[PDB]
Homo-oligomer: 138 residues x 3
């Protein structure tokens, strides 16, 4: 039996702070916060049944880029279904790898986009998803 020490791991709040901006977003860098928040707030009021989503390629990803970054997604569509739709947009074959990341974690396919947004949207009222052929963002 070990009196050897435990590795004392951080909790959710410390994780969230440690990795807050660890996923890059050219969208966040090219548009000032107040303008994003304004547009995000307005689109949620105009279409309450949909959520605004920014989808961008991870820097290390070896995979085609997306023609469009800004997605307005019905809240009852699951993550798995949105993934299937984005796969078609990249023109990936079914055997090809594709992974989604929200705050450095792959969300389960059964989550609705409405739940994902409600749980993880940023203060500008957008949800940020990065994608990669790798099973980790970085």
């Amino acid at each position: 039996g070990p009196e050897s020490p435990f590795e004392v791991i951080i909790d959710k709040a410390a994780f969230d702070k440690e990795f807050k901006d660890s996923m890059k977003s050219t969208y966040k860098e090219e548009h000032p916060f107040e303008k994003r928040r304004s547009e995000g707030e307005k689109i949620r009021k105009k279409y309450p049944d949909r959520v605004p989503v920014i989808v961008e390629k991870a820097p290390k990803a070896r995979i085609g880029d997306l023609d469009k970054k800004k997605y307005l997604v019905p809240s009852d569509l699951t993550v798995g279904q949105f993934y299937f739709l984005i796969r078609k947009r990249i023109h990936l074959r079914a055997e090809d790898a594709l992974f989604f990341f929200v705050n450095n974690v792959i969300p389960p396919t059964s989550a609705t986009m409405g739940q994902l947004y409600q749980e993880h949207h940023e203060e500008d009222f957008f949800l940020y998803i990065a994608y990669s052929d790798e099973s980790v963002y970085g």
Copy 2:
């Protein structure tokens, strides 16, 4: 200038319609809809604990075929545990990939078979699970 347009993505009902015919079943093609509705009802009324599931190889799949298509499964068992067992029955190698699909999406390992049935059963009271070496059905 004006705000960049969003890509307006389809919702769940439109997803379900656009990809309903995506998944083919030899068991559904060799067994009429009325016979399967009666059979699925009879087992489902006789066996409320267990759920009836058809497990079949995706057409483009490169996996070994199963000896048995029809399964009556204790609905408390999780899909992950069912998956473990089905892997055992294919005598699949640990280095080989295997995925389950319902309506072109992989179900979560923590779901009981009852939740998957009551959420995705067809009009014949049958749950349809496809398996493949591919991370997507098509």
Copy 3:
């Protein structure tokens, strides 16, 4: 027999619940682990003790450290991300976690995983591999 009827929890757990190898279990006797598990849970009720070890067949680095004291509100996905960094895996490397031979969903909290699956020594055991099934 047209329908195939599959075996249940009693045989499942009797057959598999101790089936993943643990060098920790082999090197520390059950009585001392149970004592340490009980004590650490009463001392830090907001955390859960976790042993993380390589599956026998895995082609993957070993961990410098096995014993983790994990806040119960951290999700499995978050803990996975942290363990990946400790193994110093490259982004292109695959990594899978197994609890009782099943991959847990990333959204489960470590507190729930522990509650559902800890053993009688009051530790939760996770095995990892580059393969998508324990081996």
